[PDB]
Amino acid sequence: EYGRPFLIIKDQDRKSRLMGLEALKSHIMAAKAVANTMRTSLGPNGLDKMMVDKDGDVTVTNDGATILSMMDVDHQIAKLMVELSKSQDDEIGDGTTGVVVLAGALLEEAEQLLDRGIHPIRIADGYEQAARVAIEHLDKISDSVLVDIKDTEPLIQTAKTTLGSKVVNSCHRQMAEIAVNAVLTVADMERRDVDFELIKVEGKVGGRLEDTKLIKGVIVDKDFSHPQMPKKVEDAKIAILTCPFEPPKPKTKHKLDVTSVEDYKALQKYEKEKFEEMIQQIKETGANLAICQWGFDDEANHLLLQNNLPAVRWVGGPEIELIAIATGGRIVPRFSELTAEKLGFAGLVQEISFGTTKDKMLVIEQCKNSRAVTIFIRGGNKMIIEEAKRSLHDALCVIRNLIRDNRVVYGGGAAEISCALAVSQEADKCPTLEQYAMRAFADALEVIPMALSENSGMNPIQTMTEVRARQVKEMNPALGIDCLHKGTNDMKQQHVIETLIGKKQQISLATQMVRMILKIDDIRKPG
């Protein structure tokens, strides 16, 4: 019959394939490469990465999620790790590099068991069992503390711990205070949620980083329309409008026919009567400042200047709603609907001018109890501003997590060491060949102290051996790696605090991703 080369698949001669253990080994190598790249940016002593864009733009960052997002890869496993980091960032907002490090360590540990002749489904089941045991152990050692506006000290400590790893650590006390104050101002407590559209983060290059501050009001990049208007008002009553200061115009197609000189003069009179009428309508309500979403005409501008009432032109919708929420006023669509009950009170409206440029900005401040605040970031470099924004976002996310759930554990590797001890203790009672997988999980759960010690410059095996011996001898699960060399291993005394849901998310997400990676056994792709 001569079964000569017969064509089954389209483009058969230009596609490749990989089967068996070779595909699994390639996946493990890719995961190890990604984890080893991400290892060095862990801890208060970690370094950061410089990423060059497709167009030549520079980003200096320490955030694992941003680094993995800005890297471009071909390997499907690498893309899976990127998506894992992004999912962690979306859910929790912190600990996006520890999860990828843990996943890489776990996949690396599975390799010896694969070589010894163990079905990968058995490895996945053992990993599931160990993860469940570790998670059950984790909530047993957690301590709940507090959420209130009166104390704020544990929240400040948590924010300090989360900001300790960034370039902002020069003023991390100040920025932690800013973050906790903003979240407590914006937060809704009966429903236990916050909205990040009520926090506006803006930054302008120049000045000093320490000039960063919090404004319980609004700051916008606009100015007063007429150059001869006053630059400050101290008891401002704000009328917020969404209609242009122009004569009205129906939306449907229309034609106004002029057939006589009398009609011409009637139209001429009507045009200016409208301009006068709108200004008298605005003035009759007692307002002192007007804000509009659209433009003015020259006549309206001069009338506004003449009647001693400054105005702001060409603002945006989000800015208008933020201003209304801050000042307690309401947005009105017509001048006919303007009443003194719809104005907003602001204790100060000012125009701030920066250095030798012409750039000017408007600040609204000193309102009564407000649900909107802004963060004003300053710095000497654009990348400084960007990294400050990212660090502040991390702090806000952590404080939000504390609002959602208010029980914590202690960092520096203490939780990982305790979980590894618990898993190793439990594995001694499992006879059904799964003890190997459980001990592999226990070994891979101890990569965080290795990374921390190696970054800090000490000896990993000796350090963690001594720490684990101390933990098992005494009864303090709050002992970790002394990264900053203060002379103690007690993180409870050193005030190193981490949220519980962060650790739970890391462990569960990493375990499930590792299971997915292990399950695959074939790959097909073009050349």
Binding site: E1, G3, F6, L7, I8, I9, K10, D11, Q76, L80, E83, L84, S87, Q88, D90, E91, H119, P120, D125, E128, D193, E197, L198, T242, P248, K249, P250, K251, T252, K253, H254, K255, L256, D257, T259, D263, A266, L267, Y270, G317, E321, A324, I325, R330, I331, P333, Q505, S508, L509, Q512, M513, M516, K519, I520, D521, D522, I523, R524, K525, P526
Partner: protein, 521 residues
């Protein structure tokens, strides 16, 4: 030779060689999905031209993703698609059975045997096997209202054993059973929503008896209105609420400025009339398929009412079915009977997104799944796994006849056909024996995937099934055989009834082809 019959480029092949080639190609096609069967089956990764990857364990999905252009091989894809459309489960087994039939009857074809005898033997064997399955199936006439639930749960758990969510099968089976029992009499699939929100763990997946959908585009003022109601009234509309021209066909001709001003005022009067007509009905939540303007948003926010626009048609239909209203294109007859009612409405943060939840309606005829996970393909495979259980539960609700799995039914059918074959003489005996031998590919593949000694286990299964243990199959964890009916490995009889008919029909069609002719381009 001077003038040729057909156009140049035509290719033809006839006789035994092309039949053997077709049999050979079907073997490759079956080898493509061989290792994805059983509780210890792996999955495959396919990368397309655009770089988009797909990770799958579903036989039909894998076969569709493969770019098969062989005319004989396309039949095995077609039967898999047919099985998926008809019963929704069993896509790999039918392909394996078809390939096994062809491989078993290859040598007799090579000996010069006439294919129609083979076709007749296949048809006889298929009819006998289907009749025997229908005879030995197990059913309960009047079991219970609660013994009608454990059957569905067992079927779903068996269907979920070989998938990515195998560890949480007890968690997911309950939800799928609830979803199906909360669904009408037509059991429409579109009345079940599936949403995928990144972040969180698999155990965080949830089922809402009610409705929930993603936040849509919002204008200025949307943040100034409340976001939680206890006993609201819901208006569902197909009307556009914003200031606009009445008709694109219109035109206004006017002479005086007073009439100009009246014309300007008329549009605001019209819009405010519609808004007041909506407001005076008592509704607290407003949903529309058409854009909701900023003026309308601020109007609603100034009176503590919630508005949403550009809601998808499917979501709006599901909301109407859950609450009990009706879509209105006119606000001139907003009575009470056209307003929906729910026991609580909220907006919540889920994994970086904002979702609207309507929960508490007891008269609901629908439900919604919220699925969590770590990746897009993770969630896609979760949804694919859920679909398999949903279809199986629907079929089981239709008819409640089940048989044990793990190879017990195939062993019984093989034993029956082997016993029958000894009665008849001639080449029919040989062909029926080959058909009976072809049926035990499923236990062999199960043991091969699990990593057992398949020969010894098959010998033990054969020895047990003949001594008299109708429901005996392989035990994956115990390395041995076990009664699969007392171990709760169940599946409806349709999966095997449809698999046999589909596989037998594809085998006959391929054998009955004599020559293949290809036209240019």
């Amino acid at each position: 030779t001077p003038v040729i019959l057909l156009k140049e480029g035509t290719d033809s092949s006839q006789g035994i060689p092309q039949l053997v080639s077709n049999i050979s190609a079907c073997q490759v096609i079956a080898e493509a999905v061989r290792t994805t069967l059983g509780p210890r089956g792996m999955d495959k990764l396919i990368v397309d031209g655009r770089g988009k990857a797909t990770i799958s364990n579903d036989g039909a999905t894998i076969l569709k993703l493969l770019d098969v252009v062989h005319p004989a091989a396309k039949t095995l894809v077609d039967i898999a698609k047919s099985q998926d459309a008809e019963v929704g489960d069993g896509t790999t087994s039918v392909t394996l059975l078809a390939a096994e039939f062809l491989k078993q009857v290859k040598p007799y074809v090579e000996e010069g045997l006439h294919p129609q005898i083979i076709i007749r033997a296949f048809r006889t064997a298929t009819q006998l096997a289907v009749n025997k399955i229908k005879e030995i199936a197990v059913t309960v006439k009047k079991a219970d209202k609660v013994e009608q639930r454990k059957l569905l749960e067992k079927c779903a758990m068996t269907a979920l054993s070989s998938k990515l969510i195998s560890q949480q099968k007890a968690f997911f089976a309950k939800m799928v059973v609830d979803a199906v029992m909360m669904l009408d009499d037509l059991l429409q699939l579109k009345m079940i929503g599936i949403k995928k929100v990144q972040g969180g763990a698999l155990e965080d997946s949830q089922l809402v008896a009610g409705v929930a959908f993603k936040k849509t585009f919002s204008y200025a003022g949307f943040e100034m209105q409340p976001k939680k109601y206890h006993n609201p009234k819901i208006a569902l509309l197909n009307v556009e609420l914003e200031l606009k021209a009445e008709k694109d066909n219109a035109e206004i001709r006017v002479h005086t400025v007073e009439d100009y001003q009246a014309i300007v005022d008329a549009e605001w009067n019209i819009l405010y009339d519609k808004l007041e007509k909506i407001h005076h009905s008592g509704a607290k939540v407003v949903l529309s398929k058409l854009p909701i303007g900023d003026v309308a948003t601020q109007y609603f926010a100034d009176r503590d009412m919630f508005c949403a626009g550009r809601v998808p048609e499917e979501d709006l239909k599901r909301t109407m079915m859950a609450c009990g209203g009706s879509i209105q294109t006119s606000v001139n007859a907003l009575s009470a009977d056209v307003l929906g009612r729910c026991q609580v409405f909220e907006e919540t943060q889920i994994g970086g997104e904002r979702y609207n939840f309507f929960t508490g309606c007891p008269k609901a005829k629908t439900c919604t799944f919220i699925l969590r996970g770590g990746a897009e393909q993770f969630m896609e495979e979760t949804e694919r796994s859920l679909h398999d259980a949903i279809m199986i539960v629907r079929r089981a609700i239709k008819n409640d006849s089940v048989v044990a799995g793990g190879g017990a039914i195939e062993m019984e059918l093989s034993k029956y056909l082997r016993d029958y074959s000894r009665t008849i003489p001639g080449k029919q005996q040989l062909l029926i024996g080959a058909y009976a031998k072809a049926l035990e590919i499923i236990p062999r593949q199960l043991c091969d995937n699990a990593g057992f000694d398949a020969t010894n286990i098959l010998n033990k299964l054969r020895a047990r099934h003949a001594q008299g243990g109708t429901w005996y199959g392989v035990d994956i964890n115990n390395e041995d055989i076990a009664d699969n009916f007392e171990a709760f490995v169940w599946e409806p009889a349709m999966v095997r009834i449809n698999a046999l008919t589909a596989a037998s029909e594809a085998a006959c069609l391929i054998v009955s082809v004599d020559e293949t002719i290809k036209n240019p381009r």
